[PDB]
Amino acid sequence: KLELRLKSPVGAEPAVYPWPLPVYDKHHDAAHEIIETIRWVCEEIPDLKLAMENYVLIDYDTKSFESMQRLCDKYNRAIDSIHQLWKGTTQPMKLNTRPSTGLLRHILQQVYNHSVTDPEKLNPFSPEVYGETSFDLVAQMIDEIKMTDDDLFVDLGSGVGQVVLQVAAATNCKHHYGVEKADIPAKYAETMDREFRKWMKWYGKKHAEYTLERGDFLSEEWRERIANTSVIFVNNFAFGPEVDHQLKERFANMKEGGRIVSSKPFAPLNFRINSRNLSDIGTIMRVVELSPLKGSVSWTGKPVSYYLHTIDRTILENYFSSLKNPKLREEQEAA
Ligand SMILES: CC(C)N(CCCNC(=O)Nc1ccc(C(C)(C)C)cc1)C[C@H]1O[C@@H](n2cc(Br)c3c(N)ncnc32)[C@H](O)[C@@H]1O
Numbered sequence: 001k002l003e004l005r006l007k008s009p010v011g012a013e014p015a016v017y018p019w020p021l022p023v024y025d026k027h028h029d030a031a032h033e034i035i036e037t038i039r040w041v042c043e044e045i046p047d048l049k050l051a052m053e054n055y056v057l058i059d060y061d062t063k064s065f066e067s068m069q070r071l072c073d074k075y076n077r078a079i080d081s082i083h084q085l086w087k088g089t090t091q092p093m094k095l096n097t098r099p100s101t102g103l104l105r106h107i108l109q110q111v112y113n114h115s116v117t118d119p120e121k122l123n124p125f126s127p128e129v130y131g132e133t134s135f136d137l138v139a140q141m142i143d144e145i146k147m148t149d150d151d152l153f154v155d156l157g158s159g160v161g162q163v164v165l166q167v168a169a170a171t172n173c174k175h176h177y178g179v180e181k182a183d184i185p186a187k188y189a190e191t192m193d194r195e196f197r198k199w200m201k202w203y204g205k206k207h208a209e210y211t212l213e214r215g216d217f218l219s220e221e222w223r224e225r226i227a228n229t230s231v232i233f234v235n236n237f238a239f240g241p242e243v244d245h246q247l248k249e250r251f252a253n254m255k256e257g258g259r260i261v262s263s264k265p266f267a268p269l270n271f272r273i274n275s276r277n278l279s280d281i282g283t284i285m286r287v288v289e290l291s292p293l294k295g296s297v298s299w300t301g302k303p304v305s306y307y308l309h310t311i312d313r314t315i316l317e318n319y320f321s322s323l324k325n326p327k328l329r330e331e332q333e334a335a
C-alpha cells in the first residue's frame, strides 16, 4: 500500500496521502492539494521557496506515483535542511502568528476537502465555491469591520462552519460562535472543527477561540446570547419574512455599537423616523451597503453585496428631542 507524505514545516505529524490519491470533489483532488500545500509552505518560508524549482511544480505528472513521490521527497529533503538551518544561528519561523489571507484560503479548502463528503446534501454562494466567493466577501468584511479582543462574534446559521473558522483565524475576538440547527451541516461541522485544528497546527498558525454548536438561534437561550454579542454575521438572503421578523426582535436587545452583517438588510438604507414607524428596527440602527465582490456574480446573475447594521440609539434620541421642540415638531409634521 503506497503513500505520499509531507513533513510539517513546524514538526507536527506529517500529512499522509494514500496512493492512488483521493478525489475530493469535481474540482479538487489530493494531487492538487499537495501541490498547493507545498506552494503555500514555500510562501511561509523564503528558503524553501529558494530551494524548489517553482515553475516546474505545474510540470509534474499527478497521475504518476514516481513523479509525485519525486515532488514530495524534494519538498521533504528541503524541509529537513530548513529544520537544520533553524538549529544554527538562523531564527526559526515565528510560531503562533495568524495565517495570511492566501494561506487561510488554502487551509479552509483543505479542511473542507477532508471533511465534506456529500456537497449535494447541502443547499448567494454554495460552500463548494467558498474559496473563490464568500471567502473574499468575508475577508473584505473582516478588513472593513475592525474587531478587537472586546468583541464576541456569532455566525447565525453557520452551516459547516467555514465563516466561523475564517473569522477565528483572522481576528482578535474574545470568542467566536457558530450555531447551526440542521444535523447534516452540524455533523460535518464537527469534522471541519477537528480538521481545522489539525491543519492549523500543521502549518504552525494560530487562531482565536471558537465553538461550533448545534442549536436553534431563535430559541430562548439564544435570545440572551444574541443580546450579548457585539458582531453578528447572518446570511439571511433567502430567509422568510417571519424568520427575519424574529431576528429583528432579537437584535433589538443588542448593545450600542453592536453590529450585524447580512446578505439582506433588516431595515431600509434611507429609513426616516416618524410616528407610524416608531417601533421599527430602523429607529435604532444605521444601515449601509458594503462594497461588492468585484468580478463575481451570484446564481441570481447579480453582484453580491452585503449590509452592515450598527446599533445606534441616538437616532431615536434625536427624534424624541425634536418632538419636544415646537419649531422642529411643526417642521417634522409636514407630510
Ligand atoms: C444561509 C445561511 C443562514 N447559512 C449559511 C451556512 C454557512 N454560513 C454562512 O454562510 N455564514 C455567513 C456567510 C456570509 C456572511 C456575509 C458576511 C457575507 C454577510 C455572513 C455569514 C445557512 C444555514 O442556516 C441554517 N439555519 C436556518 C435557520 Br431558519 C436556522 C435557525 N433558526 N437556527 C439555526 N440555523 C438555522 C440552515 O440550517 C443552514 O445550514
Ligand SMILES: [Br-]
Pocket: 218, 243
Ligand atoms: Br427557523
Ligand code: NA
Pocket: 049, 050, 051, 052, 053, 054
Ligand atoms: Na526557487
